Each structure stands twice: as structure tokens, then as C-alpha cells.
Amino acid sequence: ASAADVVVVHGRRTAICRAGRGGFKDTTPDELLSAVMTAVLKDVNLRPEQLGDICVGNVLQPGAGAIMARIAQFLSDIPETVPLSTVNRQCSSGLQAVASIAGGIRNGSYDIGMACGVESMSLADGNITSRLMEKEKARDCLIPMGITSENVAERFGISREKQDTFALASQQKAARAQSKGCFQAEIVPVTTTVHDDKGTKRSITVTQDEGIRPSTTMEGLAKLKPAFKKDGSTTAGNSSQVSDGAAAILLARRSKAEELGLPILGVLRSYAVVGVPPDIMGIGPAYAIPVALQKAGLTVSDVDIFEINEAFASQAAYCVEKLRLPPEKVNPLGGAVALGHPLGCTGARQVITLLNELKRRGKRAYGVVSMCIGTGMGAAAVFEYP
Amino acid sequence: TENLYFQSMAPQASAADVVVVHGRRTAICRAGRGGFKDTTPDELLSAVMTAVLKDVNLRPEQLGDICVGNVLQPGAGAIMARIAQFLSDIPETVPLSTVNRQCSSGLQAVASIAGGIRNGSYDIGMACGVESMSLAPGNITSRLMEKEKARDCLIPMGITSENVAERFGISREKQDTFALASQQKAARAQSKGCFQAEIVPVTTTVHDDKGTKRSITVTQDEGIRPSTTMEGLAKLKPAFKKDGSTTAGNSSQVSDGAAAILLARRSKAEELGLPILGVLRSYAVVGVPPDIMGIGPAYAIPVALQKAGLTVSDVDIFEINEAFASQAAYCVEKLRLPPEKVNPLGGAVALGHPLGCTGARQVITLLNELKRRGKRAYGVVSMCIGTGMGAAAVFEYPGN
């Protein structure tokens, strides 16, 4: 517990909605990001100008959303004096934003800052060398992530039934968690418009994660067509749903949090990023997690919760088995198969879901957030709850 | 700052300092019509990544991370950058990400690798910047116009040049004088060989309009135009505004280029026997009004100096980016910098400004000049940033 430690003060997120057909299908990402930035500042009552920097994870906007994010800041009436940037490490971008704010604090650039992630996959739309095909690993960076799911399932022998069992459990856990109110602290309601019959915007308020489908049955999952490959085992049912969402997290040097009387929700203890074959990008967490634990000084047995991103059941299941994780410790409130996976948001989202569960349990504990990353990487972060 | 032992330029040399081991850049070419007009940015970035590793003979898999600054590619060029890594045969086990803080992205890449080292994530990494302005807004809310500062983020940077020229009273003559000096300094520096160490030749193809493909090798910055005269600059039409003072001549030229920088924890550099070209001492990022974004360095520099524990007098060279002569001139006068210390080899009006690259490029240009001089010294790299920011970094060159 050093004065120099980077602590997580507080975080909020939007509900996660299905892309194209859900409540945020007509809502621009700057609006999603503004709602969560605004909520985090208000919740801890931090003067906006106390922010040393804002870092936004984002994957699909031009330039990784730098203009869009800056516009959001101003939509939140956060003053121009507070700077902003964006980061893209694909599916990890949201957690990357956390690591980059942590890094700025440790560089002496500022004492406090905000790490966000956002993605509008509803509003989604490099210039690459002509000799791509001379270089197999360059070529492999264009493999659709859904095909890498199938590659992982075949190389490492993860059956359809394994995948579906995994997905039904993620759905079922998510349903109970939602009913018990586990997501109510973290979600901020967002009021927006959705377009109608005759062109008129009509108002709605989104308070709940749309992809949690308690009607999921094992019979129904087994019936689904493959989503990417003729004789494949990856389906819409055992994959993350394409989604819209935002999340914002306030981080501070411990001594600054104390100076200002801000709560400490968690402490960042380690962050590990490793590279794997893009081909089978899903194996990332299997290699990121051990390095993160080593750096934080821990073993698998010391961790209470692992939030491992469920891009696809194939890769998530493989990682749990390879690492010999106690299954009851993995995504106890469900993961992305149920919650959705708005690319740039998910990493920050996980941190909030993780720490709010550790908080409820109220015991000093360690938790991991980890995900696979397109183009062949894994990231993992270790956090300590007080 | 206020402790018993403080002395403004006292040496500090911890095992934890983040040091710059080495750096290389492409020559910078004019967008659309230059040598890199047909070269994709992955190729530009590959050439510099390859060069830096080879130059210091680092095993590529020793890299803990690669961070690439980029502004105009989709997703800030993450797919592109990763492809470039593999074009350099840097193995998959080395991870990569991209960053966008607009014009500062290349320096931001340096700060982000520095930060990863400070986080305990790795001991050594590569900070890069790249931009193909030859080849390259988003989904924004419907109520932009309800929020003036949001609206202001869509003001063309060329119009913010005019805004700064009018708000702060910087004449056309002031601007042209500045641009002639930048060109003249750049021509001499090129003739003396100042850029020879840092530039890595790139061999690429250009498509001729006869439908013919031809191999060429670019070894020199295309924008350095010794034929610039005062008379010629005074005759140019305004580039953005009817009665304006900003022109193609007193602005940075739209450009293509990449730069790569290897950074390490000092103790790791020493374990591996790697050279130390410089040491990163501070990094400051501040916000200013987007409509006069050019003033950024005037507010970023003082903060960076305070953090590094320095005053303007302690600095030997300021590399201040010359996006526009208006903005650059304002910043030199506001800060009362000795002019001989600002961009001694010329800046972007002459060298060009490939958005994501520049910040990295500046670092390399700065450190190579301090190295030539061979004295222990401090240097500053700073730039204004679209949508209303400034960044500044302090670097220490060892020696004497």
C-alpha cells in the first residue's frame, strides 16, 4: 500500500445493447462516452478540471475516435484544459486505456485521470502493402476473428457441446446476476432517441444489458447454424454478440485520492501484454495471465475472480482448461456471450464488473481481467480489492 | 522541486530512468506528388522498425511492446502497424498497439512506451510514428451546434492558424520571415549532413502515369527548398481564407513519413550493452481552446520544464513543431525563447509534417544534434495539437 500506487477510484458503464437492432442503434459513440464520463465525475464529485488526462479505447472509428472522444468531453462540459487521446489494442483497448492512464501517472505527467472505452458497432464501416501474401503472418492479420475461433476449436479440440455448455452457463449466470441487481450500481441509464416509421426520433431510456437472454436452452443452442464456416462449431449462440457500449474509470495516485478524499475501489497491481499467432488469437489469456500473475507476485490459487473475455466460447473454454482455473471463479456474473462485446469498451467494462463483485464480497482479494486480442495478442491485469 | 538537494540542472541517473537507446526515420516526402506517394504506411513503418533493431543489433523478441502513433488510418492503424511488424520479421510474440493524440501522436508513442516500462509491463520497447497523407472524422452527435467547443473541433487547422494570427497579431511578414529562416536553416543542415545519421534510405516503387512501375530509393527530405526567397513567399495566395496570412509557403507541407525510437529502462540498456542516446525527463500534455490550438507549446513547455526541474535558460535546443509559422512564431515570442535555440536545423515548414510521425521525428532530430555538440544538455520537443492541446517533453543528452 504505497503512496505511489495507482488506484481505481470509481467506474461506470452504459448498459450494453445489440448492434443494429438494440436501444443504442441510433446513438453515436460520443453520446455513449459522454454519459459515462459525466456519471463518473458526478458520482465522486470531482471537479472536471482536476483530470490530468482522458484516454479512450476505441477500435472502429477513424483515427481510433480522437475527434469523436474530444467532442464527447465537451458534451460532458469537461473543460478544454483537460487533454485527451485515444488508444487501439483491438479487443483490449479499454483495458489498455487503464494501463496508459496508469503509465501517465507513473511518468509524473499527472496524478489523476480517466480511462474509458467505447464502441458503436451499429455505426461501424487500411492502406496495406501489395506484398501481403509474401508474408504469412501479415496475411493472417486479415483472418476474420470468427475463423480464428474455428482454428482454436480444431487445433485444441474444443467440441461444439463444450462450446454450447460454456455459453448456456454464461447466459444463466448473467440472468441470475441481473435479477439479483449485480449490474445496477455500475450501469448508468442513458436516455437517447431511436428512429421510427416516419423519420421521427422517439425517446427511450436504456437501463439493462439487452443480450442477456434467459430463454437460451441447450436444445436451442445445439440447433443453430455455424456463423463463419460450413462444418464449423462457432455460432451466434456460443459467440459474443456484436454490441454498442461505453465505460469510464477514474484512476489516481493513491496520495492524490487521499488528499481529495476519493474512494479506492481497487488498486492496479500488474499489467501484461503478450503476442501469440494471429491464427489462433483466442489463446492470448493462456499466456497473458501467468505473466500478469508473476508480475503481481501471485499464483492462480491467490485469485478470487478471473474475468476472462468470452469473445467466443471456443477460446474462452480453451483458456480456462489450459490454465486449470477453478470454473466457479471464471466470469461468475456471466461474460460477453451474454453481456455483449463492444470492442473498445469491453476491457474497461470488465474492470468495473470485476471490482463491483469483489466489493460486494467485501474481503481483501485479487482479481484478473484478461482477453484475447485480434491480430494475435493477449492482455491481463491484476487488481486488488481492499 | 523544493527539497534540500535541488539544483536546477543537477544530474540524476537512476536504474529506473527511461532512456532512448537509438532512433531512425525515413526521409519525409511531399504527399501526392513525392517519392512515397505510392508507398503504403506499413512499408514506411517497417523500414524504420527494421533499421532501429539492426542498428543496435537487438534481437527483435527482446521488444516488450511496440507503440505506433498515427492519426488518419482507420482505428489509428492498428491492423496496418501489426502488418508492418511482420514485414520486418518481428515475431508475433512482440505485442503492438496504436495511439492518437493528433499531431503529438509520435511523441505520445514515446510517452506510452515510457509508461509501460514504469508500469513494470516490460523493460524495453519501440515507439514509432507514421503517416501516409498521400493515401489516407467519424460518427458525431446531431447536436454538435448546441456545444460551441465541440463545433470548434471541426475548424480546419489552417483556419486556427488565421485565428492565432489575428488574436495575437502575427503579421504576414513575421510569418514569411519565420518560414524563410526555417528553409534556409534546413538547407544548410542538409548540406552539412546533419540528417544523414538519422535518415534510413527506403527503396520503393512509384507508378508513372504511363502505366509503368519504377523502383526508386529515397534518401533526402523533399520539402527542403533552397530556392525559397522572401519575394517568392510574399507573392503567394492565402491557402484557407480570403484576406488571410497563412499560405503554403509559411505552413508545413502535407507529407509522408515514419520514425522509430527504441526506449529501455536504464538498467536493461546497461545489461544488454545498448547505447544511451538520451534520457526522458518529463512529459507534459495540456489543453487549450481548439479554435486557437496553435498556442499549445506556450502552455505545454512551462509545465514540462517545471516537471523536469528546469527553466528556459537551462535548455540548449527547443524543437517546436512548425505546423504554421503563425503559431510557431507566437509560441517563441510568448515564451521569450532565444531564437537561435529554436529549430536550429529548420522545422516542418521545410521538413514536412506527416501527422503521426512528427513527434517521433523531432526526438531523433533533437538528440542527434545534441550528440554532435557532445555536451551534457537538455532539449525540448513540443507541438500544438488539433482540437486544442499542447505537448512537451524534456530530454537529457549525456556527455561532455
PDB file of C-alpha atoms in Angstrom, chain A residues 147-310:
ATOM      1  CA  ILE A 147     -12.448 -18.038 -38.328  1.00  0.00           C
ATOM      2  CA  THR A 148      -9.758 -17.863 -35.582  1.00  0.00           C
ATOM      3  CA  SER A 149     -12.422 -19.236 -33.239  1.00  0.00           C
ATOM      4  CA  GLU A 150     -12.787 -22.280 -35.517  1.00  0.00           C
ATOM      5  CA  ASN A 151      -8.986 -22.609 -35.751  1.00  0.00           C
ATOM      6  CA  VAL A 152      -8.751 -22.669 -31.977  1.00  0.00           C
ATOM      7  CA  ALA A 153     -11.563 -25.250 -31.781  1.00  0.00           C
ATOM      8  CA  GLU A 154      -9.744 -27.576 -34.226  1.00  0.00           C
ATOM      9  CA  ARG A 155      -6.120 -27.173 -33.105  1.00  0.00           C
ATOM     10  CA  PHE A 156      -7.008 -27.627 -29.487  1.00  0.00           C
ATOM     11  CA  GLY A 157     -10.023 -29.934 -29.789  1.00  0.00           C
ATOM     12  CA  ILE A 158     -12.915 -27.973 -28.269  1.00  0.00           C
ATOM     13  CA  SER A 159     -16.202 -29.669 -29.203  1.00  0.00           C
ATOM     14  CA  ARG A 160     -19.454 -27.996 -30.144  1.00  0.00           C
ATOM     15  CA  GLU A 161     -21.075 -29.350 -26.978  1.00  0.00           C
ATOM     16  CA  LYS A 162     -18.152 -27.923 -24.926  1.00  0.00           C
ATOM     17  CA  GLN A 163     -18.765 -24.569 -26.561  1.00  0.00           C
ATOM     18  CA  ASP A 164     -22.537 -24.649 -26.069  1.00  0.00           C
ATOM     19  CA  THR A 165     -22.247 -25.837 -22.445  1.00  0.00           C
ATOM     20  CA  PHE A 166     -19.970 -22.858 -21.854  1.00  0.00           C
ATOM     21  CA  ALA A 167     -22.438 -20.413 -23.467  1.00  0.00           C
ATOM     22  CA  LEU A 168     -25.512 -21.635 -21.594  1.00  0.00           C
ATOM     23  CA  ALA A 169     -23.611 -21.269 -18.318  1.00  0.00           C
ATOM     24  CA  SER A 170     -22.584 -17.682 -19.246  1.00  0.00           C
ATOM     25  CA  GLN A 171     -26.224 -16.865 -20.084  1.00  0.00           C
ATOM     26  CA  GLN A 172     -27.616 -18.497 -16.951  1.00  0.00           C
ATOM     27  CA  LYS A 173     -25.104 -16.763 -14.634  1.00  0.00           C
ATOM     28  CA  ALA A 174     -25.834 -13.455 -16.377  1.00  0.00           C
ATOM     29  CA  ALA A 175     -29.595 -13.878 -15.899  1.00  0.00           C
ATOM     30  CA  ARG A 176     -29.305 -14.542 -12.162  1.00  0.00           C
ATOM     31  CA  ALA A 177     -26.774 -11.748 -11.728  1.00  0.00           C
ATOM     32  CA  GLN A 178     -29.134  -9.290 -13.455  1.00  0.00           C
ATOM     33  CA  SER A 179     -32.062 -10.396 -11.296  1.00  0.00           C
ATOM     34  CA  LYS A 180     -30.050 -10.051  -8.069  1.00  0.00           C
ATOM     35  CA  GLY A 181     -29.163  -6.463  -9.173  1.00  0.00           C
ATOM     36  CA  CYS A 182     -25.445  -7.073  -9.622  1.00  0.00           C
ATOM     37  CA  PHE A 183     -25.226  -4.675 -12.539  1.00  0.00           C
ATOM     38  CA  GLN A 184     -27.373  -1.879 -11.039  1.00  0.00           C
ATOM     39  CA  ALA A 185     -24.528   0.056  -9.304  1.00  0.00           C
ATOM     40  CA  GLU A 186     -22.299   0.005 -12.387  1.00  0.00           C
ATOM     41  CA  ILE A 187     -24.825   0.775 -15.147  1.00  0.00           C
ATOM     42  CA  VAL A 188     -25.829   4.398 -15.720  1.00  0.00           C
ATOM     43  CA  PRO A 189     -29.144   4.821 -17.508  1.00  0.00           C
ATOM     44  CA  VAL A 190     -28.784   6.548 -20.902  1.00  0.00           C
ATOM     45  CA  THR A 191     -31.615   8.493 -22.418  1.00  0.00           C
ATOM     46  CA  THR A 192     -31.440   8.638 -26.179  1.00  0.00           C
ATOM     47  CA  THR A 193     -33.602   8.512 -29.316  1.00  0.00           C
ATOM     48  CA  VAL A 194     -34.345   5.686 -31.719  1.00  0.00           C
ATOM     49  CA  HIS A 195     -35.764   6.302 -35.271  1.00  0.00           C
ATOM     50  CA  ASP A 196     -39.290   5.273 -36.205  1.00  0.00           C
ATOM     51  CA  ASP A 197     -41.710   4.669 -39.086  1.00  0.00           C
ATOM     52  CA  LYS A 198     -41.904   8.174 -40.459  1.00  0.00           C
ATOM     53  CA  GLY A 199     -38.390   9.526 -39.676  1.00  0.00           C
ATOM     54  CA  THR A 200     -39.219  11.000 -36.227  1.00  0.00           C
ATOM     55  CA  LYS A 201     -36.781  10.460 -33.337  1.00  0.00           C
ATOM     56  CA  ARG A 202     -38.622   8.763 -30.340  1.00  0.00           C
ATOM     57  CA  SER A 203     -37.193   8.927 -26.739  1.00  0.00           C
ATOM     58  CA  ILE A 204     -36.132   5.907 -24.708  1.00  0.00           C
ATOM     59  CA  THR A 205     -34.036   5.149 -21.631  1.00  0.00           C
ATOM     60  CA  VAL A 206     -31.737   2.141 -21.582  1.00  0.00           C
ATOM     61  CA  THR A 207     -31.100   0.643 -18.134  1.00  0.00           C
ATOM     62  CA  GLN A 208     -30.365  -3.074 -18.894  1.00  0.00           C
ATOM     63  CA  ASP A 209     -27.994  -5.266 -20.856  1.00  0.00           C
ATOM     64  CA  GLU A 210     -30.020  -6.428 -23.896  1.00  0.00           C
ATOM     65  CA  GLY A 211     -28.050  -9.581 -24.772  1.00  0.00           C
ATOM     66  CA  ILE A 212     -28.781 -11.485 -21.554  1.00  0.00           C
ATOM     67  CA  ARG A 213     -31.261 -13.983 -22.956  1.00  0.00           C
ATOM     68  CA  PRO A 214     -32.681 -16.187 -20.170  1.00  0.00           C
ATOM     69  CA  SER A 215     -34.661 -18.097 -22.887  1.00  0.00           C
ATOM     70  CA  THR A 216     -31.429 -19.737 -24.060  1.00  0.00           C
ATOM     71  CA  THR A 217     -31.730 -23.515 -23.864  1.00  0.00           C
ATOM     72  CA  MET A 218     -29.198 -26.236 -24.656  1.00  0.00           C
ATOM     73  CA  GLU A 219     -31.546 -27.704 -27.311  1.00  0.00           C
ATOM     74  CA  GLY A 220     -31.867 -24.251 -28.920  1.00  0.00           C
ATOM     75  CA  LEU A 221     -28.091 -23.661 -28.921  1.00  0.00           C
ATOM     76  CA  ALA A 222     -27.414 -27.084 -30.490  1.00  0.00           C
ATOM     77  CA  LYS A 223     -29.814 -26.259 -33.356  1.00  0.00           C
ATOM     78  CA  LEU A 224     -28.025 -23.074 -34.513  1.00  0.00           C
ATOM     79  CA  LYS A 225     -26.246 -22.777 -37.886  1.00  0.00           C
ATOM     80  CA  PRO A 226     -22.486 -22.097 -37.992  1.00  0.00           C
ATOM     81  CA  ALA A 227     -21.741 -18.372 -38.226  1.00  0.00           C
ATOM     82  CA  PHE A 228     -18.466 -18.434 -40.256  1.00  0.00           C
ATOM     83  CA  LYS A 229     -17.602 -21.907 -41.690  1.00  0.00           C
ATOM     84  CA  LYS A 230     -19.525 -24.704 -43.426  1.00  0.00           C
ATOM     85  CA  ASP A 231     -18.817 -27.571 -40.942  1.00  0.00           C
ATOM     86  CA  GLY A 232     -17.940 -25.251 -38.038  1.00  0.00           C
ATOM     87  CA  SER A 233     -18.851 -25.220 -34.342  1.00  0.00           C
ATOM     88  CA  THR A 234     -18.872 -21.438 -33.793  1.00  0.00           C
ATOM     89  CA  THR A 235     -22.382 -19.933 -33.790  1.00  0.00           C
ATOM     90  CA  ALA A 236     -24.129 -16.695 -32.884  1.00  0.00           C
ATOM     91  CA  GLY A 237     -25.156 -18.585 -29.719  1.00  0.00           C
ATOM     92  CA  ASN A 238     -21.685 -19.519 -28.478  1.00  0.00           C
ATOM     93  CA  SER A 239     -20.037 -16.235 -29.599  1.00  0.00           C
ATOM     94  CA  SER A 240     -20.093 -12.706 -28.247  1.00  0.00           C
ATOM     95  CA  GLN A 241     -22.877 -10.604 -29.677  1.00  0.00           C
ATOM     96  CA  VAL A 242     -21.853  -7.536 -31.703  1.00  0.00           C
ATOM     97  CA  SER A 243     -22.663  -4.550 -29.464  1.00  0.00           C
ATOM     98  CA  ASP A 244     -22.725  -0.854 -28.570  1.00  0.00           C
ATOM     99  CA  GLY A 245     -21.490   0.432 -25.176  1.00  0.00           C
ATOM    100  CA  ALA A 246     -19.214   2.669 -23.105  1.00  0.00           C
ATOM    101  CA  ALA A 247     -17.433   2.565 -19.771  1.00  0.00           C
ATOM    102  CA  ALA A 248     -15.359   5.118 -17.808  1.00  0.00           C
ATOM    103  CA  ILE A 249     -12.920   4.553 -14.961  1.00  0.00           C
ATOM    104  CA  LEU A 250     -11.265   7.111 -12.709  1.00  0.00           C
ATOM    105  CA  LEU A 251      -7.701   6.357 -11.593  1.00  0.00           C
ATOM    106  CA  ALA A 252      -5.395   8.223  -9.247  1.00  0.00           C
ATOM    107  CA  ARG A 253      -2.111   8.123  -7.478  1.00  0.00           C
ATOM    108  CA  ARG A 254      -3.012   6.867  -4.031  1.00  0.00           C
ATOM    109  CA  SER A 255      -1.740  10.001  -2.271  1.00  0.00           C
ATOM    110  CA  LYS A 256      -3.931  12.168  -4.537  1.00  0.00           C
ATOM    111  CA  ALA A 257      -7.053  10.066  -3.879  1.00  0.00           C
ATOM    112  CA  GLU A 258      -6.362  10.556  -0.162  1.00  0.00           C
ATOM    113  CA  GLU A 259      -5.646  14.248  -0.481  1.00  0.00           C
ATOM    114  CA  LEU A 260      -9.023  14.780  -2.204  1.00  0.00           C
ATOM    115  CA  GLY A 261     -10.956  12.220  -0.054  1.00  0.00           C
ATOM    116  CA  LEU A 262     -11.799   9.975  -3.013  1.00  0.00           C
ATOM    117  CA  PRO A 263     -12.797   6.338  -2.552  1.00  0.00           C
ATOM    118  CA  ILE A 264     -10.492   3.482  -3.501  1.00  0.00           C
ATOM    119  CA  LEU A 265     -12.427   0.743  -5.309  1.00  0.00           C
ATOM    120  CA  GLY A 266      -9.308  -1.195  -6.334  1.00  0.00           C
ATOM    121  CA  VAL A 267      -5.561  -0.999  -6.885  1.00  0.00           C
ATOM    122  CA  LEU A 268      -3.828  -1.855 -10.188  1.00  0.00           C
ATOM    123  CA  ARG A 269      -1.016  -4.331  -9.386  1.00  0.00           C
ATOM    124  CA  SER A 270       0.146  -5.676 -12.748  1.00  0.00           C
ATOM    125  CA  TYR A 271      -0.435  -5.391 -16.500  1.00  0.00           C
ATOM    126  CA  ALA A 272       0.886  -7.919 -19.009  1.00  0.00           C
ATOM    127  CA  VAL A 273       0.625  -7.891 -22.762  1.00  0.00           C
ATOM    128  CA  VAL A 274       1.906 -10.826 -24.831  1.00  0.00           C
ATOM    129  CA  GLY A 275       1.884 -11.829 -28.506  1.00  0.00           C
ATOM    130  CA  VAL A 276       0.503 -15.074 -29.957  1.00  0.00           C
ATOM    131  CA  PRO A 277      -0.157 -16.370 -33.506  1.00  0.00           C
ATOM    132  CA  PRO A 278      -2.918 -14.231 -35.118  1.00  0.00           C
ATOM    133  CA  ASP A 279      -4.247 -17.509 -36.500  1.00  0.00           C
ATOM    134  CA  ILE A 280      -5.342 -18.654 -33.115  1.00  0.00           C
ATOM    135  CA  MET A 281      -5.541 -15.263 -31.435  1.00  0.00           C
ATOM    136  CA  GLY A 282      -8.026 -16.645 -28.912  1.00  0.00           C
ATOM    137  CA  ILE A 283      -5.302 -18.359 -26.833  1.00  0.00           C
ATOM    138  CA  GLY A 284      -3.998 -14.965 -25.599  1.00  0.00           C
ATOM    139  CA  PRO A 285      -5.244 -15.110 -21.965  1.00  0.00           C
ATOM    140  CA  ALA A 286      -3.486 -18.503 -21.566  1.00  0.00           C
ATOM    141  CA  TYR A 287      -0.183 -16.627 -21.949  1.00  0.00           C
ATOM    142  CA  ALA A 288      -1.077 -13.184 -20.652  1.00  0.00           C
ATOM    143  CA  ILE A 289      -2.452 -14.427 -17.305  1.00  0.00           C
ATOM    144  CA  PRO A 290       0.634 -16.284 -15.992  1.00  0.00           C
ATOM    145  CA  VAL A 291       2.854 -13.254 -16.829  1.00  0.00           C
ATOM    146  CA  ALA A 292       0.472 -10.800 -15.089  1.00  0.00           C
ATOM    147  CA  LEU A 293       0.334 -13.018 -12.006  1.00  0.00           C
ATOM    148  CA  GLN A 294       4.152 -13.376 -11.925  1.00  0.00           C
ATOM    149  CA  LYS A 295       4.466  -9.594 -12.101  1.00  0.00           C
ATOM    150  CA  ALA A 296       1.909  -9.050  -9.324  1.00  0.00           C
ATOM    151  CA  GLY A 297       3.656 -11.791  -7.281  1.00  0.00           C
ATOM    152  CA  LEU A 298       0.769 -14.249  -7.334  1.00  0.00           C
ATOM    153  CA  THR A 299      -0.335 -17.752  -8.311  1.00  0.00           C
ATOM    154  CA  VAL A 300      -3.678 -18.875  -9.730  1.00  0.00           C
ATOM    155  CA  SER A 301      -4.644 -20.004  -6.206  1.00  0.00           C
ATOM    156  CA  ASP A 302      -4.392 -16.428  -4.801  1.00  0.00           C
ATOM    157  CA  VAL A 303      -7.040 -15.054  -7.226  1.00  0.00           C
ATOM    158  CA  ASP A 304     -10.751 -14.863  -6.327  1.00  0.00           C
ATOM    159  CA  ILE A 305     -12.242 -13.904  -9.704  1.00  0.00           C
ATOM    160  CA  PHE A 306     -10.958 -14.155 -13.236  1.00  0.00           C
ATOM    161  CA  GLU A 307     -12.906 -12.008 -15.711  1.00  0.00           C
ATOM    162  CA  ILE A 308     -11.819 -13.655 -18.954  1.00  0.00           C
ATOM    163  CA  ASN A 309     -13.441 -12.191 -22.022  1.00  0.00           C
ATOM    164  CA  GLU A 310     -15.802 -14.515 -23.875  1.00  0.00           C
TER     165      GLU A 310
END
